[PDB]
Design a protein around this ligand. Structure first.
Ligand SMILES: Nc1ncnc2c1ncn2[C@@H]1O[C@H](COP(=O)(O)OP(=O)(O)OP(=O)(O)O)[C@@H](O)[C@H]1O
Ligand SMILES: Nc1ncnc2c1ncn2[C@@H]1O[C@H](COP(=O)(O)OP(=O)(O)OP(=O)(O)O)[C@@H](O)[C@H]1O
Ligand SMILES: Nc1ncnc2c1ncn2[C@@H]1O[C@H](COP(=O)(O)OP(=O)(O)OP(=O)(O)O)[C@@H](O)[C@H]1O
Ligand SMILES: [Mg+2]
Ligand SMILES: [Mg+2]
Ligand SMILES: [Mg+2]
Lengths: 102, 1030, 103, 103
């Protein structure tokens, strides 16, 4: 979870910066409109709606999520031992008593 | 208004000539450019949405006639054109102006447009190219400016309107994929005078069902008064030329020894039917096990047909409806009505269809009358809902016995005579959609390539159909069972039946007796079943007996029961079992298609015979897409409403997102959504019509509406499961709990947003619990999640589960978890877990039930075979040490979050601001000293008491002020009113607006105690140290 | 004993009918059960949690009768009890016998 | 744990005013003393030295039954201060007891 959180934080701008060539646009009579990027996105979405398809391609697992020891050790640092430390002795005693007798 | 029609090869934007009469008496004389709207009537279930046009005076046009460019509809007037339309000149010449229009252009013209130097120069070039003018030319959508060059991709504000070519944005899109090559202006696929020379004898051509009924008004020729629509056929003009006669008198269709006489008309041009094929109504098609291709020939002797109509022999075809007692009367009456026509023709082996209304079975409108009794107009109120056939065998020959191929029936000579029940196969859905033709409630058209389970059923039934010529008793029973109601079992059964053409018997739970069954109920049931079946099975080949809701009749033995009551249950079970197999070998091809809503309760004695059990899952993402595509279709919405304005969806909708956003909903829910969307769209349309704005000629569903209709449907569902109405807390109130805030976000929402990285069966740690000193947000956080996340929120009201008896607590826990598991994205809020899950096996406790219940918790909460982990569990306590360790483990409750006292002035100011947020604070003084002056032993809840106390003091001040004012007024007058009367006679709203000044805060802070002593706080601190310090 | 049945068919002299697991929470023994439930191929009946008891008078006895009857009538299977304490406490009870008659 | 749930549960009620009393209150659980519930704690005091006159005058002048303009048989002088001081501050019910005893 920590590793995927870090990856998502680092990957926010990966899909925003690059240009899109899936469709070509001429932009005539654009004067009088303050919005530029949102209008381009809406035009692209209109064209995609006219040409919508459901199929999608796969991606390499490592660039979706990956496990690293640097975060693993920190996760180990925030310990959460299930067994109650004050209760381990009692449990050990009762387990032994069960094992030896009955 | 109805106007005569003709076409020309003019430009798309060329003005449309209109006759002088209409231009003067209805056209607006003050308008510089007159605009009207035209509707093209076409062979379909409704008129087309109106298209707007610009018109000008033309004296050359005859009475009530118009001329328009054929290129406005993508064709040329080479073939016979339509002769009239419906037209109306817009009153006040109101038209809208589109802000933006999206065009798709070819690569060459786009290159030319870059080559063109300047924006204004390009604008003028487009002006000359496609006759587009500012505030003068009107544009439409889904139209083509020129073949293979440009197309109107989209129009946002309205489907049609004026263009501010000076300012309207033109979204020009290059056709990078060369899609424009698919455009085709009704052009010919070449043409030859004689593709085959001297082929007068016959022609071979395809036969397919005519997709819709036909209205006489749309017919080019002028047939006589009667005996027309029963033998119509329609084709393209050139096919008529290949037959050497244009819309010839009569044609004959002959194959497999069956020869029929037909009448062929020309298919009118604007319709978009396929090429080189015969289009005919079901009446003629039903006569054949038709091959995809069929041969036809000239028949001139058909014009010399003979009325030999004496003593005709008729027969009721086998079918479910024909054997019903009540329907038979209306069937007889409608058959007599059909044969009441003067000149209907008929020939042996013909199937004659007969439609009628299902619910008029009891409405005897009137007795026969001496004169002036007719049905024609009287029927227009009601439209048919059921269909049957009649099979005709023989007729008199008389002195004209030289020929008997085709003949007329005359009411003056024909009499109603019938024989016993015959039998014949239905028409497979793949060849002719009868419902479509007769506008019935169409059974959903499944697509076997996508839906898994239906394929199994259809395969089984078609196997039993094909084994007829193998001739063995291989027929097998089939049982459908589902995890939930309303999953379309009966629909898919009807689909299979209609697809394979298998007569369907629909017995159901409209039985006669189910309470106090000792009163011979077994007989009343089984005799009824046997009587209903025995009147159909001997005349259906194959046949299907469908028993809806069989679950609620073949009940199984109850754990607790009367010893003798159960005997009736056993008897009915056994006799049902017997009659199950009796039909198996008493008739060939019989298939028993039963349905059940929970297979666990079907009797093993009955179920053991079963050999095919199909579970029908709730439709996954892929299916819902298709279901939406269906219910949104034109042939669904436009039906059954009869609204004078046709209906349609706006193309900007998106199946792909809609499907994903409608997860978990059953098909009935989907239809509910569609219906609600239709309602809201119609309400919007009539609201706009009420307003003075421009009136669209069609009502358009919008995704912006579906987005909230789906939410309302989901809220309806949430009410179904009985969840409480949690208050509307917002995610912003939580204040100084950022750490826990993020922790919660990382589990409740992180694997729910962008559901791809977590999309796996992993242990997604659906457990979380808050613990710590009293009053630090544990319940508020839950209240927020209950409404800010759209997850179903189940409340476990403390020791709600515990119960009177020994085992009903153990039933309550399991019922709670089962019901939650029914709705996968759900939350369980164990508030004060202490009362329900105490430490197991302590000496200082009695009864032991508290141990059993906690054990059951440990079992069902985690257990084994767990899947679909979306069931979160959120618990809270003041102190955890009373809980058992076996709960304080991953998989159940991984992290214990200690929402401690903030101990930090940043957090203190944060919580003070979050509490003060939503009421006005006077800013003359700064609040920070309120944090600085409180010692850190003060607690989130007592800062709430601080704020509320300060508010109450400051508002008591206003109360005293208004008291003084009312006392002063009473002194001025005769003291004739109290405060209560003052508040309805007089109002001083602005005076009552209490605004707190921090002086009030500095007063209150002196008076309020901390919510906990140091004694308790050290205890909880030590608790945290034990659990968190490690 | 199902995998190697000719080895196990002979010599019915001595055998052990069942096994009892216990240990610290989280030591995989539920997962041991799960794996043994599915890979082994032997049928597996999952009476998880004290669902045995029932409201009505002495219904527990009849319930166990039915359970063992289904176990026998199903081909060889494992009766899986978990949180055994919930279904078989010590002999002594101040309450009704409906909670110890079951034992 | 039920009362807490019904008091400030997720589906929190409204328009209901819980009014509690007892002699020894701190034996109420601290989670019931948390402000937001039972939030204002109000002491009552028996000593009220020299204020016992006010109560005395009240109880003697109590007119609950409007049929008569009095129930207790007051006298003209009404020098209640002497007895009020003489009371030595027993309780609040003590004075009603004195009233009835003297009557
Ligand atoms: N998958 C589906 N596709 C289209 N329409 C459906 C579907 N499932 C149900 N319907 C609609 O439901 C009605 C008939 O199916 P219905 O919901 O009654 O099924 P059923 O199997 O009889 O259900 P149940 O036994 O749960 O009551 C029709 O209005 C039909 O349009
Ligand atoms: N940090 C905080 N943020 C927002 N509201 C708070 C906060 N602390 C206290 N409150 C308010 O004071 C009350 C505290 O609610 P809380 O969720 O702590 O109740 P609870 O779980 O029933 O508490 P208890 O621990 O006494 O059982 C609510 O009315 C809430 O609005
Ligand atoms: N062989 C294994 N060793 C350790 N952990 C395992 C193993 N196999 C699976 N696990 C993981 O660790 C968990 C092991 O403990 P588990 O939750 O099964 O305990 P349990 O037997 O149900 O305990 P209890 O009834 O005492 O709460 C599994 O749920 C799984 O998530
Ligand atoms: Mg049904
Ligand atoms: Mg609480
Ligand atoms: Mg376990």
């Amino acid at each position: 979870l920590k590793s995927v959180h870090r990856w998502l934080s680092a990957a926010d701008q990966s899909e925003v910066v690059p240009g899109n060539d899936n469709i070509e646009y001429f932009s005539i009579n654009e004067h009088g409109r303050r919005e530029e990027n949102r209008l381009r996105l809406k035009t692209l979405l209109q064209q995609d709606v006219v040409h919508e398809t459901k199929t999608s391609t796969s991606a390499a697992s490592e660039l979706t999520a990956v496990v690293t020891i640097n975060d693993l050790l920190e996760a180990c640092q925030e310990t959460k031992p299930s067994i109650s430390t004050s209760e381990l002795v009692k449990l050990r005693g009762i387990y032994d008593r069960f094992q030896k007798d009955r | 208004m109805k106007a005569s029609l003709t076409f020309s090869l003019s430009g798309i934007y060329a003005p449309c000539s209109i006759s002088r009469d209409i231009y003067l008496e209805y056209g607006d004389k003050k308008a510089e450019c007159l605009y009207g709207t035209i509707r093209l009537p076409q062979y379909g279930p409704g008129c087309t949405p109106g298209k707007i046009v610009h018109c000008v005076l033309d004296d050359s046009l005859p009475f009530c006639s118009i001329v328009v460019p054929s290129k406005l509809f993508g064709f040329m007037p080479t073939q016979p054109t339509m002769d009239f339309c419906y037209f109306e000149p817009i009153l006040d010449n109101v038209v809208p102006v589109l802000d933006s229009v999206t065009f798709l252009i070819n690569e060459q013209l786009y290159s030319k447009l870059m080559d063109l130097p300047q924006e204004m120069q390009q604008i003028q070039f487009l002006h000359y190219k496609y006759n587009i003018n500012s505030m003068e030319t009107v544009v439409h959508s889904r139209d083509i400016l020129t073949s293979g060059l440009c197309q109107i991709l989209n129009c946002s504000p309205f489907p049609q309107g004026l263009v501010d070519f000076t300012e309207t944005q033109l979204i020009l899109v290059n056709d990078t994929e060369q899609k424009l090559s698919a455009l085709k202006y009704a052009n010919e696929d070449e043409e030859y005078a004689l593709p085959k020379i001297g082929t007068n004898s016959a022609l071979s051509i395809d036969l397919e069902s005519l997709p819709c009924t036909i209205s006489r008004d749309l017919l080019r020729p002028a047939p006589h008064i009667n005996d027309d629509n029963s033998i119509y056929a329609f084709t393209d003009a050139e096919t008529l030329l290949r037959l050497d006669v244009t819309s010839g008198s009569f044609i004959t269709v002959s194959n497999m020894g069956c020869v029929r006489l037909v009448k062929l008309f020309v298919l009118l041009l604007p319709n978009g039917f396929k090429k080189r094929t015969i289009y005919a109504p079901p009446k003629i098609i039903a006569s054949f096990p038709d091959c995809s291709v069929v041969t036809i020939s000239k028949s001139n002797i058909g014009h010399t047909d003979i009325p030999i109509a004496n003593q005709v022999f008729i027969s009721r075809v086998g079918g479910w409806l024909q054997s019903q007692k009540c329907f038979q009367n209306i069937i007889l009456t409608t058959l007599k009505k059909f044969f009441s026509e003067s000149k209907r023709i008929l020939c042996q082996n013909d199937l004659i269809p007969i439609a009628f209304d299902s619910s008029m079975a009891d409405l005897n409108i009137a007795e026969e009358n001496d004169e002036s009794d007719d049905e024609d107009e009287l029927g227009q109120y009601y439209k048919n809902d059921s269909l049957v056939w009649f099979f005709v065998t023989s007729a008199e020959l008389d002195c004209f016995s030289k020929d008997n191929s085709h003949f007329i029936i005359d009411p003056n000579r024909t009499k109603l005579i019938t024989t016993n029940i015959t039998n014949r196969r239905p028409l497979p859905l793949s060849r002719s959609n009868l419902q479509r033709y007769y506008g019935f409630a169409e059974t959903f058209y499944y697509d076997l390539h996508i839906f898994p389970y239906v394929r199994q059923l259809v395969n089984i039934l078609e196997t039993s159909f094909n084994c007829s010529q193998r001739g063995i008793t291989l027929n097998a029973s089939v049982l459908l069972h589902s995890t939930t109601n309303n999953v379309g079992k009966a629909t898919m059964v009807r689909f299979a039946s209609k697809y394979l053409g298998i007569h369907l018997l629909e017995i159901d739970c409209l039985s006669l007796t189910s309470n106090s069954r000792q009163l011979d109920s077994t007989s009343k049931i089984i005799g009824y079943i046997r009587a209903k079946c025995e009147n159909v099975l001997p005349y259906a080949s194959p046949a299907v007996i469908f028993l809806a809701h069989l679950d609620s009749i073949l009940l199984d033995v109850n754990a607790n029961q009367d010893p003798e009551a159960i005997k009736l249950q056993k008897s009915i079970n056994f006799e049902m079992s017997k009659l199950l197999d009796d039909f198996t070998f008493k008739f060939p091809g019989t298939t028993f298609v039963g349905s059940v809503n929970n297979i666990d309760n079907v009797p093993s004695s009955f179920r053991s015979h079963m050999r095919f059990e199909i579970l029908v899952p709730v439709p996954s993402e892929a299916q819902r897409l298709r279901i939406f595509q269906w219910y949104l279709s034109s042939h669904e919405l436009n039906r059954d409403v009869q609204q004078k304005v046709p209906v349609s969806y706006m193309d900007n909708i998106s199946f792909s997102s809609l499907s994903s956003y409608s997860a978990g909903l059953t098909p009935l829910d989907i239809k509910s959504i569609v219906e609600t969307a239709r309602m809201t769209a119609t309400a919007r349309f009539y609201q706009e019509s009420k307003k003075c704005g421009w009136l669209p000629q069609s009502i358009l569903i919008t995704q912006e509406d579906l987005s909230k209709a789906t939410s309302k449907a989901r809220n309806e569902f949430s009410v179904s499961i009985g969840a409480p109405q949690i208050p509307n807390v917002t995610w912003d109130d939580i204040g100084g709990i950022d750490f826990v805030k993020g922790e919660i976000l990382d589990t409740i929402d992180m694997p729910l947003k962008h559901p791809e990285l977590f999309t796996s069966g992993m242990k997604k740690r659906s457990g979380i619990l808050f613990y710590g000193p009293p009053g630090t947000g544990k319940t508020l956080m839950a209240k927020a999640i209950a409404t800010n996340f759209s997850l179903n929120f189940f409340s476990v009201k403390g020791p709600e589960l515990l119960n009177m008896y020994i085992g009903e607590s153990e039933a309550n826990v399991r019922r709670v978890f089962q019901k939650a598991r029914e709705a996968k994205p759900c939350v369980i809020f164990f508030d004060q877990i202490d009362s329900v899950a105490p430490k197991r096996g302590n000496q200082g406790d009695s009864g032991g039930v508290m141990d059993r219940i906690v054990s059951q918790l440990l079992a069902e909460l985690d257990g084994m075979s767990t899947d679909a982990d979306g069931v979160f569990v959120i618990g809270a306590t003041n102190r955890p040490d009373l809980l058992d360790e076996a709960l304080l483990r991953p998989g159940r409750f991984d992290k214990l979050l200690y929402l401690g006292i903030p101990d930090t002035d940043t957090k203190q100011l944060n919580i003070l601001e979050a509490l003060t947020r939503k009421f006005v604070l006077d800013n003359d003084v700064k609040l920070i000293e309120l944090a600085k002056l409180c010692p850190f032993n003060y607690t989130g809840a007592d800062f709430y008491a601080l704020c509320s106390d300060a508010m109450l003091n400051a508002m008591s001040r206003i109360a005293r002020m208004v008291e003084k004012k009312v006392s002063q007024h009473n002194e001025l007058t005769g003291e004739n009113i109290s405060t209560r009367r003052w508040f309805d006679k007089i109002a001083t709203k602005e005076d009552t607006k209490v605004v707190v000044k921090m002086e009030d805060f500095l007063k209150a802070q002196e008076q309020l105690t901390p919510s906990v002593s140091r004694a308790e706080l050290n205890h909880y601190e030590a608790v945290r140290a034990n659990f968190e310090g490690a | 004993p199902t995998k190697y049945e000719p080895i196990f068919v002979n010599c019915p002299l001595r055998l052990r009918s069942g096994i009892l697991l216990y240990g610290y929470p989280g030591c995989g023994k539920t997962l041991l059960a799960s794996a043994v439930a599915q890979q082994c191929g032997l049928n597996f009946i999952s009476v998880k949690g004290p669902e045995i008891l029932n409201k009505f008078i002495g219904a527990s006895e009849q319930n166990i009768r039915e359970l063992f009857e289904r176990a026998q009538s199903v081909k060889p299977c494992i009766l899986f009890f978990d949180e055994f304490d919930s279904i078989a406490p010590k002999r002594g009870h101040d309450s009704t016998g409906v909670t110890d008659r079951v034992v | 744990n039920q009362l807490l749930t019904q008091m400030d549960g997720a589906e929190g009620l409204d328009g209901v005013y819980i009014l509690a009393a007892t002699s020894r209150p701190d034996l109420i659980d601290s989670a019931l003393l948390r402000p937001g519930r039972l939030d204002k704690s109000v002491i009552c005091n028996i000593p009220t030295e020299s204020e016992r006159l006010d109560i005395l005058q009240a109880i003697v002048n109590s007119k609950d039954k409007d049929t008569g303009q009095k129930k207790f048989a007051l006298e003209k002088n009404a020098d209640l201060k002497l007895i009020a001081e003489k009371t030595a501050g027993f309780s609040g019910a003590d004075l009603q007891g004195l009233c009835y005893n003297a009557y």
